[PDB]
Amino acid sequence: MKRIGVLTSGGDSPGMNAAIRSVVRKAIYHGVEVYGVYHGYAGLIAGNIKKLEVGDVGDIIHRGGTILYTARCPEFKTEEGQKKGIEQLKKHGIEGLVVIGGDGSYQGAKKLTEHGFPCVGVPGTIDNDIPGTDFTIGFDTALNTVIDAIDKIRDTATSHERTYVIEVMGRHAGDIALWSGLAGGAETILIPEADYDMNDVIARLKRGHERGKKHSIIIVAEGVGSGVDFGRQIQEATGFETRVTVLGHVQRGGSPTAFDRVLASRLGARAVELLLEGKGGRCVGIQNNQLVDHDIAEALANKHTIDQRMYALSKELSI
Amino acid sequence: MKRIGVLTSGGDSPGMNAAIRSVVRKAIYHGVEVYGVYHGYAGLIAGNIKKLEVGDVGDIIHRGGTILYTARCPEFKTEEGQKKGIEQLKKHGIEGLVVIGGDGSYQGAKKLTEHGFPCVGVPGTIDNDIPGTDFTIGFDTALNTVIDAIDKIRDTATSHERTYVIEVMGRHAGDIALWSGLAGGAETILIPEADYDMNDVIARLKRGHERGKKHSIIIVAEGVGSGVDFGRQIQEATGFETRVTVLGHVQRGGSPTAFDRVLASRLGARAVELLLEGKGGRCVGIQNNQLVDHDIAEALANKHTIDQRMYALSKELSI
Amino acid sequence: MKRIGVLTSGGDSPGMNAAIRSVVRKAIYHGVEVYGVYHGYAGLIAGNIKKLEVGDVGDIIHRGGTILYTARCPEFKTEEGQKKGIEQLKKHGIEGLVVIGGDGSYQGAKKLTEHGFPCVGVPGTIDNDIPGTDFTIGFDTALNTVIDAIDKIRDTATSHERTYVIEVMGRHAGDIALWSGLAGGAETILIPEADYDMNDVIARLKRGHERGKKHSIIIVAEGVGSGVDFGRQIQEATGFETRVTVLGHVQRGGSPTAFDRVLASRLGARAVELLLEGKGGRCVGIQNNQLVDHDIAEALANKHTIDQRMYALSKELS
Amino acid sequence: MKRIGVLTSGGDSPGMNAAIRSVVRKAIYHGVEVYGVYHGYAGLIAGNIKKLEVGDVGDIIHRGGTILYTARCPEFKTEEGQKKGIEQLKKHGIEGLVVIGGDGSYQGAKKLTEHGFPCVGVPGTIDNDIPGTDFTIGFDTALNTVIDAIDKIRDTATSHERTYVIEVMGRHAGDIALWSGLAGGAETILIPEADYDMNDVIARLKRGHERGKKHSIIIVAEGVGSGVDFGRQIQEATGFETRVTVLGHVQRGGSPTAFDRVLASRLGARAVELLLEGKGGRCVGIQNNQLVDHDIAEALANKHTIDQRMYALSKELSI
Ligand SMILES: [Ca+2]
Ligand SMILES: [Ca+2]
Ligand SMILES: [Ca+2]
Ligand SMILES: [Ca+2]
Ligand SMILES: [Ca+2]
Missing domain, CATH: 3.40.50.450 (Rossmann fold)
Incomplete structure (x- = not known):
């Protein structure tokens, strides 16, 4: 040409x-x-x-x-x-x-x-x-944006002995959630390409409260659901106070x-x-x-x- | 002692x-x-x-x-x-x-x-x-956390000629919204300590749309209202595609x-x-x-x- | 107008x-x-x-x-x-x-x-x-640029039980060195505005070594001398594995x-x-x-x- | 086991x-x-x-x-x-x-x-x-530490119209240098895995300056040589204003x-x-x-x- x-x-x-x-x-x-x-x-x-x-x-x-x-x-x-x-x-x-x-x-x-x-x-x-x-x-x-958020939210989570649902992007693909949640030591990751059992998540969490764990982070791809509903399901079920965070579009920008x-x-x-x-x-x-x-x-x-x-x-x- | x-x-x-x-x-x-x-x-x-x-x-x-x-x-x-x-x-x-x-x-x-x-x-x-x-x-x-965020959303806002409402922390104080919205070049900042008028805000946005500014960003302290709401008010008015972002507790953590x-x-x-x-x-x-x-x-x-x-x-x- | x-x-x-x-x-x-x-x-x-x-x-x-x-x-x-x-x-x-x-x-x-x-x-x-x-x-x-570096150098110094000297900019002012070293938990800061004694520094590092401290960061303002030189006087004096970093114009740039x-x-x-x-x-x-x-x-x-x-x-x- | x-x-x-x-x-x-x-x-x-x-x-x-x-x-x-x-x-x-x-x-x-x-x-x-x-x-x-440094040296070099040589780590490997140089937009990259000719470097440097370019970054893997030299060399070859940054061990640290x-x-x-x-x-x-x-x-x-x-x-x- x-x-x-x-x-x-x-x-x-x-x-x-x-x-x-x-x-x-x-x-x-x-x-x-x-x-x-x-x-x-x-x-x-x-x-x-x-x-x-x-x-x-x-x-x-x-x-x-x-x-x-x-x-x-x-x-x-x-x-x-x-x-x-x-x-x-x-x-x-x-x-x-x-x-x-x-x-x-x-x-x-x-x-x-x-x-x-x-x-x-x-x-x-x-x-x-x-x-x-x-x-x-x-x-x-986008991942380093997510795990930078994960790094920060862990600071409060640890300080306050609280559990966080962070809702990441990935409208159909669970890539971001998989990779970032792996990188943030996320103890629960919920993606579209993989079955999950909410009763399993709840038990696991209860189980860690016992084994000395008071904080916890749950990465959730938007393609799975709204973090807000997920958090509700968890606090309602464990009595643990449970914050929710939707990172949204920060993910789209950056150097x-x-x-x-x-x-x-x-x-x-x-x-x-x-x-x-x-x-x-x-x-x-x-x-x-x-x-x-x-x-x-x-x-x-x-x-x-x-x-x-x-x-x-x-x-x-x-585990 | x-x-x-x-x-x-x-x-x-x-x-x-x-x-x-x-x-x-x-x-x-x-x-x-x-x-x-x-x-x-x-x-x-x-x-x-x-x-x-x-x-x-x-x-x-x-x-x-x-x-x-x-x-x-x-x-x-x-x-x-x-x-x-x-x-x-x-x-x-x-x-x-x-x-x-x-x-x-x-x-x-x-x-x-x-x-x-x-x-x-x-x-x-x-x-x-x-x-x-x-x-x-x-x-x-926290301010540098919010401006990192403001920076990133400005990146996407600019490419899409879109208007963002970003909800920040400070349950009773507008300090964060004030200081960061200044540092972030935010064209609208809403804090508990000063009158605001949404008609003024709306007009201002329509004004710039003509002037040639296709993207804008509104900073909002939680102590004033829900971002996922001010945003609705703006677009349910002006014809502009308006996205909303609540940064939440990422603000609490970090080095x-x-x-x-x-x-x-x-x-x-x-x-x-x-x-x-x-x-x-x-x-x-x-x-x-x-x-x-x-x-x-x-x-x-x-x-x-x-x-x-x-x-x-x-x-x-x-302006 | x-x-x-x-x-x-x-x-x-x-x-x-x-x-x-x-x-x-x-x-x-x-x-x-x-x-x-x-x-x-x-x-x-x-x-x-x-x-x-x-x-x-x-x-x-x-x-x-x-x-x-x-x-x-x-x-x-x-x-x-x-x-x-x-x-x-x-x-x-x-x-x-x-x-x-x-x-x-x-x-x-x-x-x-x-x-x-x-x-x-x-x-x-x-x-x-x-x-x-x-x-x-x-x-x-600039200060935040300097502490990011100090944080990173703290990571490697800790792993290796080593002592680093970091030369920061300033020209004739020791503000950067004093503010960053203080923010970076440095154990030695050297600036134009205060006076120091090398023998003091030496013994102070030899002492910290006694209490079991295995790593140190010395921060030196360029206006006081060359980071390289200080590193040298120190390593000869104590025998410790001593490295030196000159951050240079990195401090000048950035958002x-x-x-x-x-x-x-x-x-x-x-x-x-x-x-x-x-x-x-x-x-x-x-x-x-x-x-x-x-x-x-x-x-x-x-x-x-x-x-x-x-x-x-x-x-x-x- | x-x-x-x-x-x-x-x-x-x-x-x-x-x-x-x-x-x-x-x-x-x-x-x-x-x-x-x-x-x-x-x-x-x-x-x-x-x-x-x-x-x-x-x-x-x-x-x-x-x-x-x-x-x-x-x-x-x-x-x-x-x-x-x-x-x-x-x-x-x-x-x-x-x-x-x-x-x-x-x-x-x-x-x-x-x-x-x-x-x-x-x-x-x-x-x-x-x-x-x-x-x-x-x-x-390490790459990302390097590119952030490069980014920062781009700011000062562009406002002052200076040419820079940045020495990066890698004892016998040119991986960091090659990769960060590409990532950074280096005009010149020097590494041990590939022959270079200093004169083609100066020439390539002069052609670019005549074509309007007022600032230039040059990356050198420590394995090729000392940044201070390539600095001296090309300064006195071109006459341009030239600076030398040795990042050293910062590359080794960080989250x-x-x-x-x-x-x-x-x-x-x-x-x-x-x-x-x-x-x-x-x-x-x-x-x-x-x-x-x-x-x-x-x-x-x-x-x-x-x-x-x-x-x-x-x-x-x-080019
Ligand atoms: Ca694979
Ligand atoms: Ca940018
Ligand atoms: Ca910062
Ligand atoms: Ca910049
Ligand atoms: Ca670290």
């Missing part, structure tokens, strides 16, 4: 900027131009397009959020919109698009490709729920961790390589510590999973 | 350990023993008393929470209680007591003195309302910042000096960058106030 | 952009325009100047460094240089100037006022080495802490107020937890001093 | 405690006793061995360093030192040893296995320089990142599993995102490599 475009869609995620930065610096290394599309697919329909310069990506690698913004777009679900997007792309002479994000911001990469516009997906979310890759951009940072920066630079650069060598309708990622690329069509079919041996581990480490 | 005691009551607070460390290591310098009372006044009543050694304050200057724990004590409000508690004191040959915390807890230090046990209070809470001091131990730390560690080391040492100088029924504090001790009785009558000129400042800097 | 300017001079400092943000939003409140001068005094001479919009003050409140940059200017230390400064000032209709920084930024604020140009100065340095104020914009953030963001916001806002009230040749600051302003020339006249009791406290707590 | 021991040798590393917690809690899950061996190998020889109880691990997951300490041991390469090692082991009824540490530690773990005593080795070092694993416990944390806590917890638990299945002489690890174990002698045979394509990418991204 000679010119390509880049875009972010779906939720904000720490590292997208590093991802974006990479798309650009790489294309430059190959004599290619990059045009930033703003406000995601909404921005694409709208014509929100402006060339990015070597200097528009200088000093953003550390920066959370996405400089190109992001927004939902019902219109892009229709042939109608898909059509107008390509016009606007064609208008600026853009022959290739790197789509960075999650929430089937891939559907669009696919749709686009099917209309014969070359398109590559980069995994962008905090909740690890994108196929084609073991980890997504933003997950590592991306070293893992998230490297991953974003690698992936985003891979995505460019694919466009340039003619490929399209693909999504890159990291699998088994290796760079991979896949057909979006194929990847969107792979049901998401969590490492069950780890969930097991955490139960063992926390 | 040759032997004294130390205890922490009311809510947890980052820096208390630094206070306790300082209470202990200062006493040692003067050849005085120090005994820890565990689990607040409940502990005192109970007899939870163990000498502290040099090696028990060997960390702990960086650690949040309180190694002496803390717990409520209905029983200590009744006379029979403090009595029982003084017995315990006498039983271990303790001649004085440093009471670190809110909230409070100065009440007990007072009644203790009245019963002829020499008692010194130290300002420990995150919300900042303990009289006899411009700032309480834990404040600076105390430099200001808090230094403040704790100072107040702690001062508190021990009072006891040794034979004085009692006092409480220490920082006032106009100078340390002061006041009669608890008087201190307890001074309504808590916030710097109205700063609140004002935050308004001017905001 | 209808138009002022702002610049940043001397070593950059966390929370300057907070100070800048404040200078600019505050002026906009009173219907006043702000022109930014880039690259400190060198930029003023060269007329590197651009209207700041609302726009460019962010949010940048969390950002370290200075969006206006900074650079040394030997030339401005001379009559003709200032002539160019004013020429440029007037060429843009800038009626007043807010100067943010340290290490002689104030010098220019005075000279400029002397030549009949209203200037307010704002304390901006990590080392806290600026009169007319208890704390300078950048100090709190400014809540205190630094607030101080900058207050100070900056107060600085513009002064110009608007026709006041000039003043520097803002915070003293005894109250906002104050002083005539520069006389503020610059006080030798800086540390809190002697606190140093004494830090010893008793060892 | 009813009783095993655990120890930490080599340089200390954030997450060792997490690794200990896991060794000690996993064993309890299986009704095995754990005996701590303090001060690494010098301790093993001298006895200095104490039962680890639940309480001894119930609050260390978040803590840097090693609660078991670590010390060098010249004695333990001799035959007699080892003779002494085993006696002491047999004296406490320790049927097996988990060695958590760095490289030299693996040596002794083999010698023990040879002399009829089952050992498992756990990768513990910040410099990633240990075979039988892609990453070592400590790496992630372990989510990744290091998780890795530590999986690896440590796996190490217990091995000894319990009668599989001595091994070292655990993560390779291609999968848990693995390898004969110690064999792993110790593999010269350590970095990812050349990654070093390549870092170059392309900074």
Whole structure:
């Protein structure tokens, strides 16, 4: 190619900027131009397009959020919109698009490709729920946000001999809960991919009160339920005073961790390589510590999973 | 005195350990023993008393929470209680007591003195309302916790052109909301100590939407209302997508910042000096960058106030 | 006034952009325009100047460094240089100037006022080495940078039963060393403002070793000497495994802490107020937890001093 | 096996405690006793061995360093030192040893296995320089200490238009440097696994300055040389203003990142599993995102490599 475009869609995620930065610096290394599309697919329909310069990506690698913004777009679900997007792309002479994000911001990469516009997906979310890759951009940072919260709430929990339900993000995926709860010494972790028995949680807790334990932390993925209801169930059942904490959107922001920066630079650069060598309708990622690329069509079919041996581990480490 | 005691009551607070460390290591310098009372006044009543050694304050200057724990004590409000508690004191040959915390807890230090046990209070809470001091131990730390949070939500707010309501702590004091909302560039701060008008707030938001500001962030002290409510009021009015975040108890934990560690080391040492100088029924504090001790009785009558000129400042800097 | 300017001079400092943000939003409140001068005094001479919009003050409140940059200017230390400064000032209709920084930024604020140009100065340095104020914009953030490091070095020193020496910045002031070491539970602090005896230090570490203490952190202010040297004198003297860390300019950077963001916001806002009230040749600051302003020339006249009791406290707590 | 021991040798590393917690809690899950061996190998020889109880691990997951300490041991390469090692082991009824540490530690773990005593080795070092694993416990944390430093030096370098050289740790491995440099946005990265030409460095540095760039970060792995020199060199080569930061041992400390806590917890638990299945002489690890174990002698045979394509990418991204 000679010119390509880049875009972010779906939720904000720490590292997208590093991802974006990479798309650009790489294309430059190959004599290619990059045009930033703003406000995601909404921005694409709208014509929100402006060339990015070597200097528009200088000093953003550390920066959370996405400089190109992001927004939902019902219109892009229709042939109608898909059509107008390509016009606007064609208008600026853009022959290739790197789509960075999650929430089937891939559907669009696919749709686009099917209309014969070359398109590559980069995994962008905090909740690890994108196929084609073991980890997504933003997950590592989001975890350190969660366990930093876990570290703090343990300070009070220990001081006051109290039990906390912390509700983490992960709308469908229990990744955050699994990983963070493992890392915070969480003595109960409740995920969507694994059965739980509330009567079991209650007993375990009672059991520790005896064996000298007065504080306790219960990580709960939002995809399982509302922390508020869970806490209710526990205090009502144990008489222990039981606080509840919903971390919510703090999880979505922050300076991306070293893992998230490297991953974003690698992936985003891979995505460019694919466009340039003619490929399209693909999504890159990291699998088994290796760079991979896949057909979006194929990847969107792979049901998401969590490492069950780890969930097991955490139960063992926390009887 | 040759032997004294130390205890922490009311809510947890980052820096208390630094206070306790300082209470202990200062006493040692003067050849005085120090005994820890565990689990607040409940502990005192109970007899939870163990000498502290040099090696028990060997960390702990960086650690949040309180190694002496803390717990409520209905029983200590009744006379029979403090009595029982003084017995315990006498039983271990303790001649004085440093009471670190809110909230409070100065009440007990007072009644203790009245019963002829020499008692010194130290300002420990995150919300900042303990009289006899411009700032309480834990404040600076909590503020940096809230701004870390404000920073992260600004990251997502900006990418999505969304408006956030963030509910912070301070059940009766607007200190946190004021100081952090200033440090966080929050365009709206609501505190118990100053009139607010929601029509003004709403208009202000609609105004900026035009001006070109697509994201805004409202800071709200819990002592004013429920964030998950103000948010509803705003969006059920303006057409704006409004998200809400209650940070809750993450605010209570954490490694105390430099200001808090230094403040704790100072107040702690001062508190021990009072006891040794034979004085009692006092409480220490920082006032106009100078340390002061006041009669608890008087201190307890001074309504808590916030710097109205700063609140004002935050308004001017905001429109 | 209808138009002022702002610049940043001397070593950059966390929370300057907070100070800048404040200078600019505050002026906009009173219907006043702000022109930014880039690259400190060198930029003023060269007329590197651009209207700041609302726009460019962010949010940048969390950002370290200075969006206006900074650079040394030997030339401005001379009559003709200032002539160019004013020429440029007037060429843009800038009626007043807010100067943010340290290490002689104030010098220019005075000279400029002397030549009949209203200037307010704002304390901006990590080392806290600026009169007319208890704390300078950048100090709190620096201290927290230093203790994070001390905490980390405490982790490794503890595991290995080793003794470290950490050299912190400060220039001529020992504020950082005294405040951080005290916050970090250091067992030795060495500063310009207090006197020490190496033999004291030595024996004091040899003694702590007697009571079974297996690790120590000595904190040394650069203004007192090289951390490397102290490490050496000590290891030769005792035989203990002694390492030395020079944190360096790490202390200069980072997102400014809540205190630094607030101080900058207050100070900056107060600085513009002064110009608007026709006041000039003043520097803002915070003293005894109250906002104050002083005539520069006389503020610059006080030798800086540390809190002697606190140093004494830090010893008793060892 | 009813009783095993655990120890930490080599340089200390954030997450060792997490690794200990896991060794000690996993064993309890299986009704095995754990005996701590303090001060690494010098301790093993001298006895200095104490039962680890639940309480001894119930609050260390978040803590840097090693609660078991670590010390060098010249004695333990001799035959007699080892003779002494085993006696002491047999004296406490320790049927097996988990060695958590760095490289030299693996040596002794083999010698023990040879002399009829089952050992498992756990990768513990910040410099990633240990075979039988892609990453070592400590790496992630160290990287993040490095990038935060880099971030902070970016602030001052950008306001002053300075060029910086930052010396990072890694005796013979360029992993920290390469990885943090990529993460940080280094314009220049120097490491032992890959040839560099100083002149191409100066040239690459001059081309960038002529292309407008006013500030630049340069990362040097301590194994390549001394930061102060590369500083002198390029200062007098370019004339630019140039500063030198040596981070030194800060990299060694700090609360372990989510990744290091998780890795530590999986690896440590796996190490217990091995000894319990009668599989001595091994070292655990993560390779291609999968848990693995390898004969110690064999792993110790593999010269350590970095990812050349990654070093390549870092170059392309900074043109
Ligand atoms: Ca950011
Ligand atoms: Ca902080
Ligand atoms: Ca910054
Ligand atoms: Ca730690
Ligand atoms: Ca796996």
